[PDB]
Amino acid sequence: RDAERRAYQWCREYLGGAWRRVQPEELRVYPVSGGLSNLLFRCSLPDHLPSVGEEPREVLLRLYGAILQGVDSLVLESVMFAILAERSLGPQLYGVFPEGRLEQYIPSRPLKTQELREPVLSAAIATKMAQFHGMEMPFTKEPHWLFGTMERYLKQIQDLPMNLLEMYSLKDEMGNLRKLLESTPSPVVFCHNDIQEGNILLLSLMLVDFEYSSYNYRGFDIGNHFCEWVYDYTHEEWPFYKARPTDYPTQEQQLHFIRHYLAEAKKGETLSQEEQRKLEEDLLVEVSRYALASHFFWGLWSILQASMSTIEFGYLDYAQSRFQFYFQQKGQLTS
């Protein structure tokens, strides 16, 4: 009832016209699926209550989880939302505050896990991602994000009140991953870092929820998306996700994506079929290595979330899954 009241007060404070009239009992505040970091509520005026002008009838209230409440995250996620709103690349911004946001509600659905593998959607996702990778954003251009964030998470985990750090020798393995990636060139671009089905709205596509975004290796954004082909978070029973490791894209599926990615990335350039096939081959290898970083990143994240999050989800189980999959794919690279 106090998340209910807080929602009312935020709407009344930031929104105009009829929202200043609506009574606590009138206001419809429904929890909606917001993912595994933040809370999301759909707030809507009574059906009967007339508008004064062009105020929205419905908005989304998004509240940051603890893992996204750091001052650096707050600045980035607040400015990125505002910028994309101004550029019509995201939902309009009605209220912005340290705790969260009031956003435009866009009639849409998110994609489903199995839809990521359809060749037309997959091409569209690769094109959209290349578009974002071409953008200049006012954040550090140095790729500190990946290992900087993992080292932070590792330290926070160790300082918290089954021991996955010991079982999987994560401190040592992070050094091994660092070394592997040092030997794998990957261009630094503005990355979303979380391009899963729930962040891709079918309107035709809008990519949303840039909370994890930063300049990072191109291979991470691609590899990470590919990892997401495996994980379905709509599963109704604990741990509330289902993994299907065989759903990871085949070499054919990866190539299809990579071809449409590079079509947008290298738009206008004229490249021989030799050059083109080399770009494709090189990016396939780049991606197979940076995919490992997706597993490791989100594994560490999920361990920390088991203690920081209030969302009902099998965080430790999910972490186990990611680290198991990390080692599997590392085993497959060696062969």
Added chain:
Amino acid sequence: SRDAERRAYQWCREYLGGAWRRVQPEELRVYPVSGGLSNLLFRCSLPDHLPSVEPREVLLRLYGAILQGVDSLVLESVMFAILAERSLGPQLYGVFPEGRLEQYIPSRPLKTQELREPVLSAAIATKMAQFHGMEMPFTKEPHWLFGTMERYLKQIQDLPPMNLLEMYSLKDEMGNLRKLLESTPSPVVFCHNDIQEGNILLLSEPENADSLMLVDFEYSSYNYRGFDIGNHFCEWVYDYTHEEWPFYKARPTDYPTQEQQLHFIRHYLAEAKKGETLSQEEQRKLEEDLLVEVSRYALASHFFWGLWSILQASMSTIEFGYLDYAQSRFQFYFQQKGQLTS
């Protein structure tokens, strides 16, 4: 300082491209510039002999402690970003909790005496009215004015160790001020709250007839229109370019006359009420009522910036006579209150 130079170098290198990633710290020119009384400002440029591969120069603005609170940080960051996207402010090249990297706009700030020039005063009024018409993603309730003053008063009361709070009976006077303004209606609009000559840039190569740019929305919020106008009028009195301590000069007789106020007000209303058909008697009533509104909300400018300046005496690292300035503001508050009773 040598640490300030190195930090500036590192911000530029980390956020900017091309030659910024090649220039060595010995070669980057970092210049301290007039930043005002809240934030530090540095103009950073590539040496003339280092060709580009990107801006040749940028400004690095670092928030003072009074602007480092999370609420302030979200507002000031997002506001700069929005205004950039709308071509209402400089472009944003870097944004972080400590400050920003901004496009350098060829310009100069206005001077105190230039605020009284009829053509510039009219352009300031128009631009202020334009901002007052905008919708921004911040709370629409006018909590800012007394909410911030209340916060400042409480923080001042907990500062370690003459006592201006006692001398001028500021705790009781805030209540008197609240009571006066409660009875003085003023439309709640998106306000800048710091429209002083230092924040009004005369563009050196304007592309159109808008030859001014209003910058530095760090204190911005929904607020009473009378405050934004009144505060601007108060700024006609204070010149912060004075080169010896306390680094400002006050000229109370420079406060705008009724005719100077009305000139501003006419151009403000012309923009604010653009399109609306108003009779001679309707216009004159709007103008007359606004003079009274502004006379009262001007008192809030003195009281706000007086409180701010006591706090800054402790919080700021900028060399300025913050206590001497606080005294000036509170003296003028009472002077003007004394003039209203008449």
